[PDB]
Structure 1
């Protein structure tokens, strides 16, 4: 998702689907840096 070589244009977005996984996101800390990250409906400290 994050490391994909080619991204879509904004007028035709991908809309991928995900299931059957554990969602451990600390595996991103080393590789990527985000300038924006905001969550709605949930607090970012409960995501684990």
Structure 2
């Protein structure tokens, strides 16, 4: 979608594995605020929007 038409979604009720990312691409821009990327897979969340 376009910049002014981002595709909101909700993703809950799932066993979430944040390590499928690293097999995608060189990941030019990847920086996390409030939580370290290394210790993400363990921590838990209420509702995750993308």
TM-score by shorter chain over 0.5: yes
Aligned residues: 41
- Gaps of at least 5 residues in structure 1 are 1-7
TM-score, scaled to structure 1 = 0.61
Higher relative contact order structure (alpha carbons within 8 Å, sequence separation ≥ 6)? 2
List structure 1 segments (4+ residues) > 3 angstroms apart after TM superposition.
Answer: 28-33
- Gaps of at least 5 residues in structure 2 are 42-50
Q: Greater strand share, 1 or 2? A: 2
TM-score, scaled to structure 2 = 0.60
